[PDB]
Amino acid sequence: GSFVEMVDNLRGKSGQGYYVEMTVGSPPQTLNILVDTGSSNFAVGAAPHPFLHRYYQRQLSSTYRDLRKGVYVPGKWEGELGTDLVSIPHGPNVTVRANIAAITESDKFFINGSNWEGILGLAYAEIARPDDSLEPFFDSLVKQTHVPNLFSLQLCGAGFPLNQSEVLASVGGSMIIGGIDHSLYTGSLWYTPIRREWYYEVIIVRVEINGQDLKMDCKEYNYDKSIVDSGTTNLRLPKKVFEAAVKSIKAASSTEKFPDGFWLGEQLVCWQAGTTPWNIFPVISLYLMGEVTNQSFRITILPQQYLRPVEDSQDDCYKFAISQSSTGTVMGAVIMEGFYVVFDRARKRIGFAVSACHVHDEFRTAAVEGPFVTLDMEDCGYNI
Ligand SMILES: COc1nc(N2C[C@H]3C(=O)N(C)C(=N)N[C@@]3(c3ccc(C#N)s3)C2)nc(C)c1F
């Protein structure tokens, strides 16, 4: 329905991630926490670090409980396991006793200027560290309260660079805990099954670039998995898929030549203020397995999603936010910024709808459309 207390509770951007305010301990200690559907631990800075202006002080919490167990995660971090009372101020009006990994040592984990001091891993126990016995936050929340087993994310890319002050004052999106807010999307929600409960794994059955079929065996698109990950910036594709997609994107945009560094996601490209030639770049459609047998639907993104705005001048500059992976497809903030994404854990499915905050132009919009008749979709899934 309508969850006004949780609408607009995120801040951040695709490159540095999107975070929500949380409190830990008694009296409550406020921290900014990255929303991560790609991991399953709740881990917070718990010791001074040059890039942290605050951290969890266990000695100041009367409700802190020491689990007397370490956790080593190779970026990399090490911590100490414990439990405490946790709340989300712009969230459900509940307080949960949850596991917390108190980060004592780290390497390239905390980013200078991100404004977040910890991570909220929202995926399943299978990938929790040190093992699946460490109950993830969302599992605790559902078990201890009447909050429905579902959350939804609207990640909002600004479409232009935000400076330090603007990124702190800007609304970066919404995390709706326990429901679906109809103001965050347009049109219909289309659902794809969660293939397996570890990462939020899905199956891609067809890929198009400006309506042209990439025409690869669909198992290639999910080699070795395809996941939805708010913690990843880019749309990441398996090596062979990335090579075929970049060749097609280059061919579609061939009226302008870009250096190799641009296509590698390393180098920015700039245009005179307001002259970005969006129309030369193609739309990209990913077809996902539907809930009905032999049915699929598609999600279509624009270059306003896969060209990430970066500051250089008064030029409008971007980095190509599609990159290669050796660990399967990752539908990162590139994809998620185009859509309102419903993580329906209760019904083992992920919903997509056009986001009310996606960046577009007067000629094209992102889309979620269906149904399409698609055969042997189970063959698109990779095994071993
Ligand atoms: C919170 O505890 C854990 N965190 C992570 N990750 C892996 C990273 C990563 O490479 N990606 C892609 C991701 N989705 N999440 C991590 C991030 C680190 C900085 C981000 C930003 N910005 S996101 C955090 N993995 C495990 C196994 C954990 F136990």
Residues 342 and 352 grouped into a single domain = yes
35 Cα to the center of ligand 1, angstroms: 10
Resolution number, Å: 1.7
Closest to 321 measured CA to CA, from 340, 302, 343:
302
Residues 212 and 87 grouped into a single domain = no
Task: Report the distance separating Cα 282 and Cα 269, nearest Å.
Answer: 17
Task: Report the distance separating Cα 206 and Cα 212, nearest Å.
Answer: 10
For residue 376, tell me if it sits in a domain.
Answer: yes
Residues 224 and 342 grouped into a single domain = yes
Backbone angles phi, psi at 280, to 5 degrees: -80, -25
Residues 188 and 135 grouped into a single domain = no
Residues 209 and 274 grouped into a single domain = yes
Contact 24, 98 (CB under 8 A): no
End residue of a domain, out of 117, 147, 177: 147
Computed from CA positions of residues 144, 146, 150, 151, in that sequence, does the dihedral angle turn out positive or negative? Answer: negative
346 Cα to the center of ligand 1, angstroms: 24
119 Cα to the center of ligand 1, angstroms: 8
CA 166 vs CA 54, 147, 231, 259, 303: distances in Å = 21, 33, 21, 31, 23
Computed from CA positions of residues 256, 260, 264, 267, in that sequence, does the dihedral angle turn out positive or negative? Answer: negative
Residues 51 and 67 grouped into a single domain = yes
End residue of a domain, out of 130, 147, 164: 147
Q: Is the CB of 38 under 6 A from ligand 1?
A: yes
Computed from CA positions of residues 357, 359, 363, 369, in that sequence, does the dihedral angle turn out positive or negative? Answer: negative
Structure tokens at 167: 């990124």
Task: Tally Cβ neighbours within 10 Å of residue 371.
Answer: 14
Enumerate the β-bridge partners of residue 76: 107
For residue 6, tell me if it sits in a domain.
Answer: no
Backbone angles phi, psi at 218, to 5 degrees: -60, -20
Largest CA distance in the chain: 64
User: 133: burial class by Cβ within 10 Å (0-12, 13-18, 19+)?
Assistant: exposed
Q: Is the CB of 70 under 6 A from ligand 1?
A: no
For residue 153, tell me if it sits in a domain.
Answer: yes
Residues 115 and 156 grouped into a single domain = no
Closest atom of ligand 1 relative to the 233 alpha carbon: 22
For residue 140, tell me if it sits in a domain.
Answer: yes
User: How many structural domains is the chain composed of?
Assistant: 2
Closest atom of ligand 1 relative to the 231 alpha carbon: 14
Find all residues with CB under 8 Å of 258, minimum gap 6, and list them: 250, 269
Among this protein's residues, is 229 annotated catalytic? Answer: yes
Q: Is the CB of 36 under 6 A from ligand 1?
A: yes
Contact 326, 33 (CB under 8 A): no
Among this protein's residues, is 36 annotated catalytic? Answer: yes
Residues 226 and 84 grouped into a single domain = no
Category of 46 on φ-ψ map: left (φ > 0), alpha (ψ -120 to 50) or beta: alpha
Structure tokens at 32: 């900014």
Q: Is the CB of 125 under 6 A from ligand 1?
A: no
Q: Report strand pairing: 29-36 vs 17-24.
A: antiparallel
**Cα 337–chain centre separation:** 8
Enumerate the β-bridge partners of residue 168: none
Residues 249 and 342 grouped into a single domain = yes
Find all residues with CB under 8 Å of 71, minimum gap 6, and list them: 41, 78, 79, 80, 81, 101, 129, 130, 134
For residue 348, tell me if it sits in a domain.
Answer: yes
Backbone angles phi, psi at 28, to 5 degrees: -60, 135
Mutate to test the pocket of ligand 1, among 22, 34, 39 (most ligand atoms within 8 A of CB): 39
Give the full edge-to-edge strand order of the sheet including 329-331.
226-228, 329-331, 235-238, 322-325
Structure tokens at 361: 């132009």
Mutate to test the pocket of ligand 1, among 34, 36, 42 (most ligand atoms within 8 A of CB): 36
Task: Convert the chain into a string of H (helix), E (strand) and C (coil).
Answer: CCCCCCCCCEEEECCCEEEEEEEECCCCEEEEEEEECCCCCEEEECCCCCCCCCCCCHHHCCCCEEEEEEEEECCEEEEEEEEEEEECCCCCCCCEEEEEEEEEEEECCCCCCCCCCEEEECCCHHHCCCCCCCCCHHHHHHHHCCCCCCEEEEECCCCCCCCHHHHHHCCCEEEEECCCCHHHEEEEEEEEECCCECCEECCEEEEEECCEECCCCHHHHHCCCEEECCCCCCEEEEHHHHHHHHHHHHHHCCCCCCCHHHHCCCCCEEECCCCCCHHHCCCEEEEEECCCCCEEEEEEECHHHHEEEECCCCCEEEEECEEEECCCEEECHHHHCCEEEEEECCCCEEEEEEECCCCCCCCCCCEEEEEEECCCHHHHCCCC
232 Cα to the center of ligand 1, angstroms: 8
Residues 257 and 322 grouped into a single domain = yes
Which residues is the chain interrupted after (C–N above 2.5 Å)?
74, 312
112 Cα to the center of ligand 1, angstroms: 16
- What residue numbers bound the domain in which 58 lies? 18-147
Q: Is the CB of 220 under 6 A from ligand 1?
A: no
For residue 78, tell me if it sits in a domain.
Answer: yes
Q: Is the CB of 229 under 6 A from ligand 1?
A: yes
Residues 123 and 175 grouped into a single domain = no
Give the full edge-to-edge strand order of the sheet including 295-301.
212-213, 204-209, 284-289, 295-301, 367-373
Residues 114 and 153 grouped into a single domain = no
Please measure the distance between the N-terminal and C-terminal CA atoms of the chain and give it in whole angstroms. Answer: 41
Task: Tally Cβ neighbours within 10 Å of residue 30.
Answer: 12
- One-letter identity of residue 323: S
289 Cα to the center of ligand 1, angstroms: 27
Residue 276 CB-half CA count within 13 A:
21
CATH number reported for the structural domain that contains residue 320 in this entry: 2.40.70.10
Q: Is the CB of 231 under 6 A from ligand 1?
A: yes
For residue 13, tell me if it sits in a domain.
Answer: no
Structure tokens at 15: 């490159």
Task: Report the distance separating Cα 250 and Cα 281, nearest Å.
Answer: 8
Task: Report the distance separating Cα 279 and Cα 326, nearest Å.
Answer: 31
Enumerate the β-bridge partners of residue 269: 318
Task: Report the distance separating Cα 36 and Cα 33, nearest Å.
Answer: 9
For residue 11, tell me if it sits in a domain.
Answer: no
267 Cα to the center of ligand 1, angstroms: 24
Task: Report the distance separating Cα 285 and Cα 300, nearest Å.
Answer: 4
Task: Tally Cβ neighbours within 10 Å of residue 279.
Answer: 12
Q: Is the CB of 61 under 6 A from ligand 1?
A: no
Task: Report the distance separating Cα 105 and Cα 13, nearest Å.
Answer: 26
Q: Is the CB of 12 under 6 A from ligand 1?
A: no
Backbone angles phi, psi at 182, to 5 degrees: -65, -15
End residue of a domain, out of 147, 182, 207: 147
Q: Which of 84, 139, 181, 229 is catalytic?
A: 229
